[PDB]
Description:
heterotrimer; B: mainly beta; 2 domains; 5-stranded antiparallel β-sheet; 3-stranded mixed β-sheet; 4 helices; 29% strand; C: mainly beta; Immunoglobulin-like; 7-stranded mixed β-sheet; 50% strand; elongated
Amino acid sequence: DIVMTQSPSSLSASVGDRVTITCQASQDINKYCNWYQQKPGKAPKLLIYDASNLETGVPSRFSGSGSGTDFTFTINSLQPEDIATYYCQQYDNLPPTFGGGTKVEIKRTVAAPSVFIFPPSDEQLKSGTASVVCLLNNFYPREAKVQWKVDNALQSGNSQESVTEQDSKDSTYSLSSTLTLSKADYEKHKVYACEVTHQGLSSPVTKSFNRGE
Amino acid sequence: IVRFPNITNLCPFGEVFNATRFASVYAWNRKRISNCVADYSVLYNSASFSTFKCYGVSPTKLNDLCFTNVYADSFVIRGDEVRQIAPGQTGKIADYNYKLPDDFTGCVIAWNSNNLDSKVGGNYNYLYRLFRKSNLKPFERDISTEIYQAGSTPCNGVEGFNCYFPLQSYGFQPTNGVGYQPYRVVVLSFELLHAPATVCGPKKSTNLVKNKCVNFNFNGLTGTGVLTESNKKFVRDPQTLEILDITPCS
Amino acid sequence: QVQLVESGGGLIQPGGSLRLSCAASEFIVSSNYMSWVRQAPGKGLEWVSLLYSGGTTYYADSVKGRFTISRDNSKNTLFLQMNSLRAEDTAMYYCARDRGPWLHDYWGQGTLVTVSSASTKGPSVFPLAPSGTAALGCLVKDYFPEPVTVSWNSGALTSGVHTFPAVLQSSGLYSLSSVVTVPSSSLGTQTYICNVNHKPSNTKVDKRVEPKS
Ligand SMILES: *[C@@H]1O[C@H](CO)[C@@H](O)[C@H](O)[C@H]1NC(C)=O
């Protein structure tokens, strides 16, 4: 069973850069390597069949070469519309197998997050749980540290965060971190704080609220 | 004792196995072999062949059998497709190019042919059918080149989107890995109708000894027993066409 | 005009059965190599099964003897019969026309198959109330299975919105936030309503998000 080892798994480049992805097959597959592009929530789209041939419609910026075991996929000048995950595939030997994929991100200038904090609604407190939301809006790069403080006590293990896909226009990221307590625990404390560390921040930024006020 | 027909012509297997040009598999050749004597030991002992799969017979017993007719089909395929020239196989080749029956009796013979059949820029002479609506029947040959309608729009002989040329080229190249190199295949088909056998091994006939326990061989019927004159009418001697009863012994 | 539209996905219990279909336009399904390929959430691509024009079928070992591929020429539709479904069968299931075996040159947008003994739940929607550029949103909490769609002001409000990827809480239910930044001078005058829709249940909810007084 053929294994498609794709390199690298993630890549970050700037508009107009020359992006190279490689794929190595564990056995000779001659030229039967294809390359797919998947955008978030979309289905894959075939860009290159038979190592080097361009599907009709596909911009000439895309190309590929190779025969045997070592394959190359190239984007000649990277474009905004090319944010996607790319996969190689050998399609000749049963079963067909795909490479692990290469997630491609646009590089841009540093942007600090705008940070907001939302207390739990009173409606939700009726049902026995409190969700506290922290929002980091439109930042770059993706690395951001969020630290929750309840009466100055750091919370571990009761928050989940979630990151948007890179923006088409902005090329920035957005994050939300949600801290979950029981109503009981939530009413036992006053100061609810969200602390945000990021490249574009000289020092960490805190947003807090006092329960009630 | 051994009783074969008095056939003496050599069977023309040389021009099948040693032909300088071979057919494409979609257009596989068939040579009808009859009224001759073939020395299959040349084949089943040769070191040229890399596969020699025989169904319904054992290759080394082949110099002691007779058949009504032999068919020799020949073509070229990729190396790692050789396994598909077999009964019950599925795939592009076995379904759409060359298919063997449930009850195949014969031998599949193949040998690497990269030296003869690949060119430096790719040999685009050798094709296979890639598109077809239905499966081939066993031993059926389709060489049509009609544009394949993969969609609802008619093609009017212009190939384009959803309108594919049905054949695909192997493009054999000398640097191909062994599984992508061309192999020459010969399929021998041993046919046994209710008729006098015309294709025999090279075994020499001996005297017809009656009334005595003997090991015998009548066109492939091998036993140990006593052959006597028989009053039945419908084993029969090939050369004299006389009926012989068989009674066993040791 | 070519089309591949999958349907039949949904939540289904382990050991259960499900039949996906894939209706085609312009492609005649019975004249093509046709494949099913699947994608487990946030993961790569795995080929499932293949139907030749002439009726030959191939299956990935991981589904052999459990899945069956078939078609209906009149309806020009491809089927995937699934039996004895398993946790790790959960994935998005794509049908694709194959220009020759496993050369996937046209893919449908997929149907989502969730294999679980967890029950269906509609979400509760709570507001993230604001206090230019203020930020506000909607907390869509405690639903199952995916997916949920969130729009703002029945489709009119669209710029600056961020709807986040759902995340799986330690409770086994999903939750997500959808946020938007609006001129803070427009608060008090302008109405903001998020339209939450959860097709796996028959739940639609609209939530007025207004500044907490
Ligand atoms: C083909 O040619 C080789 C070399 O001359 C010979 O040894 C072999 O017996 C030939 N095969 C047949 C079937 O005539």
